């Protein structure tokens, strides 16, 4: 291969990668949506950038090897909690270390790969019972 697939298969288990493919494949191919689902089951976090890259190379349906290349793009070794915290800190106008659930929802649903309102609120409610969200703790949590 050309992609860093050996390093992927040291982080994730090849058996799981293969089993999840077989769960979702049709005619020996997997849709991008199901590839992204599998990536998430494996603990990876694809964005729209990752999906669009692979779609532009190979279309909406991936062969096994193309799916492996997609998974390699999803690894994101450079993910860094401080960069995520600083993103939310930008909106912390009063410098309290908290953002309300509504504030967090607005951020998450307005820019980037926008979540739906229900997705955002469900994620926030899963993390905290209270309205003030410690966004440092939230970022530390979501990376795990």
């Amino acid at each position: 291969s050309v992609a860093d697939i050996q390093q992927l298969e040291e982080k994730v288990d090849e058996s799981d990668v293969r089993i999840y493919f077989n769960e979702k494949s049709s005619g020996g191919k997997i849709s991008i949506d199901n590839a992204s689902y599998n990536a998430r089951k494996l603990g990876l976090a694809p964005s729209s950038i990752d999906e669009k890259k692979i779609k532009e190379l190979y279309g909406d349906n991936l062969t096994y090897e193309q799916y492996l290349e997609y998974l390699s793009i999803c690894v994101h070794d450079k993910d860094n909690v401080e960069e995520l915290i600083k993103m939310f800190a930008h909106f912390d106008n009063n410098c309290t270390g908290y953002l309300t659930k509504s504030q967090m929802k607005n951020i998450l649903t307005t820019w980037g790969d926008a979540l739906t309102d229900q997705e955002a609120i469900d994620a926030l409610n899963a993390f905290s019972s209270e309205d003030n969200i410690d966004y440092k703790l939230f970022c530390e949590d979501i990376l795990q």
Binding site: Y37, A39, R40, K41, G43, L44, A45, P46, S47, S48, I49, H76, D79, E83, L84, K86, M87, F88, I107, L108, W111, G112, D113, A114, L115, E119, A120, D122, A123, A126, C139, I142, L143
Partner: peptide
Amino acid sequence: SLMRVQAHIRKRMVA
């Protein structure tokens, strides 16, 4: 960054 946050949230949604 924001897209990374959203990506990890969607990951968490699955497991």
